UniProtKB/Swiss-Prot annotation:
Organism this protein belongs to: Homo sapiens
Name of the featured protein: DIS3-like exonuclease 2
Illness the protein is tied to: Perlman syndrome: An autosomal recessive congenital overgrowth syndrome. Affected children are large at birth, are hypotonic, and show organomegaly, characteristic facial dysmorphisms (inverted V-shaped upper lip, prominent forehead, deep-set eyes, broad and flat nasal bridge, and low-set ears), renal anomalies (nephromegaly and hydronephrosis), frequent neurodevelopmental delay, and high neonatal mortality. Perlman syndrome is associated with a high risk of Wilms tumor.
Annotated PROSITE patterns: RIBONUCLEASE_II
Binding of Mg(2+), residues: D215, D224
InterPro entries, per database record: Dis3_CSD2, DIS3L2, Dis3l2-like_C, NA-bd_OB-fold, RNase_II/R, RNase_II/R_CS, RNR_Ribonuclease, Rrp44_CSD1
Known partners and oligomeric status: Interacts with XRN1.
Family the UniProt entry places it in: Belongs to the RNR ribonuclease family. DIS3L2 subfamily.
Amino acid sequence: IFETYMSKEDVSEGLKRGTLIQGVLRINPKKFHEAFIPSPDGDRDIFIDGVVARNRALNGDLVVVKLLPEQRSAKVVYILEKKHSRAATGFLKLLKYALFSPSDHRVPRIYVPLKDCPQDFVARPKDYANTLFICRIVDWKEDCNFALGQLAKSLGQAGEIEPETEGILTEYGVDFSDFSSEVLECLPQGLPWTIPPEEFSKRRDLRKDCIFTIDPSTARDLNDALSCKPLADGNFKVGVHIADVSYFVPEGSDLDKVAAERATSVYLVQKVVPMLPRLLCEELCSLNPMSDKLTFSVIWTLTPEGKILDEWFGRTIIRSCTKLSYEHAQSMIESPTEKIPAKELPPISPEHSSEEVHQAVLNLHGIAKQLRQQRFVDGALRLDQLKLAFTLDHETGLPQGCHIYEYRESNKLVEEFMLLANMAVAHKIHRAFPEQALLRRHPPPQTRMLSDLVEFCDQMGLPVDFSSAGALNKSLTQTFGDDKYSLARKEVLTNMCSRPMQMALYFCSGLLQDPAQFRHYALNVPLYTHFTSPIRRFADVLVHRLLAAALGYRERLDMAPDTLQKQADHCNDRRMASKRVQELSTSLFFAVLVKESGPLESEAMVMGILKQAFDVLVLRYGVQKRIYCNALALRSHHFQKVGKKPELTLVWEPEDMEQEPAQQVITIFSLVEVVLQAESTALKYSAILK
RNA sequence: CUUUUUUUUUUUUUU
């Protein structure tokens, strides 16, 4: 039996008086009996014990609590915003009712009436033990330990790719359905679409320039293009061109409401959930080569060291000549003084030659190198962990093998100019409208648990400092490197260092009072926004509208500073849910590859020792498994610590008794060899020492 | 009714 809620007027009175504290609930996955909300001060988080004192609140919901008299303990007394999707995936069992158990251990256990269950489930239920179901919570009583739910549908067989993919898509709230006819009725009509003739005067015509895009090979939507031209005085004219999406998305139409509802596109291993209809996403706005397109552009005149001497914003019309990749661009970067033959090059428009593209990407790389060096001298921080990419089968969709996604120079050449374009646009739209502008901000990391990393790195002979961000980056660069063990050292230390960092936020400039909170911590800039990808995000469409209002092409936005804050608040959770969905898609496909590729042999580094287990990080792939002594064939094992440094001694079992048993020493940053083997569970495997 | 063990894994760029 729980406790009833209190009135909204009493919530407001006690929240203004100061007896109640609001905050976002976080629920421990490994032990569901405890919950945490962040403190408004910042000293230590607020504890909520039990399931009863959580009071029907779910993970991610923004609740209001009251502290018990005496870590400080509180109980949930009200819920303002229900931020959880209230849906789950799981299994149906039997005990008037039937039991539903979700896979997630934070979601409670659900009663479903047998009217919702299918017609042959009550008799012979043995075949419905590996069937995935989607169930939605609709009501939870004050006197029931179990929620009441409605069964949506049957997903499929548990352990497959598409039932689990659609289940994890549905559990986070990603709308992966199709667009209604009231959305496609706002699209432009006429299959051979052409540019209207009144737009040859309000936009600048750059059809004769050398214009190119550099994008991955498995990409159908293109959001940006680049151009470089050498001047006659040793300078460069560099132009960045962004697809004009806001011309095709008017304000107030249902297309704009749908694009604001699904605030971003979700990219998975096998497919993509878009933001716009396929016409706008793939033909009209996506800058395919050999076609005239309407863009919105920023053009600079830069020195060879990359210093701004001129700036011009404005709407233009381009015609791209080629579509390069990240592999051809590396070929022309790494062949500076040799003509690459045309057999290994993509097709190009006949108006231009490959010499122009070759010298253009050489000049852009030359500017981008100096921009990188100046940005990291200035104090930018970059904590890059390891990401892997799979190779699929064209007839069944199963993975064949995974490789390591390498961050080459062509991913930096684009990134420097995109950061330059965002840095220009943020300054322009902040000096134009100081009370309505959409910008990003990164808070400084938490002071409480950065100190724990300080006392951890005080030991173990590691000379790092966390006084700033550029100091942290220069310390992680200039301590160890260029080895086979030092790179694993770098990976384990980066994995520990990325834990106290906060998450970046969209915000409106008319609600924060001081300019200290406008700062972006990791790039070390005072102003930042997103502008260069309007097909993938809706915040860039908002920035396009604001900058077109700032340039005098249209009237000022008629939206309040609270509407922009609400839209940014929606975009933040949409981005977070999208990132979580791609993480689980990567985990799903790796588990499928492990099960269908036998045991996998790799090396690992120990990053944590417990009494009966220790945690490794697999170097070849990038996952963090746990190894238990119960699965080991040892004679004995002993745990020691001296100077707060853990120590594990393993005494193995010899194959013959006429020989002294071997010894194994396990401490932090130790290189071991492991093998990954799937087990009888559908989506589970284990790591075992070899 | 629920895991072979105390929460926080982030930033940037392109898909």
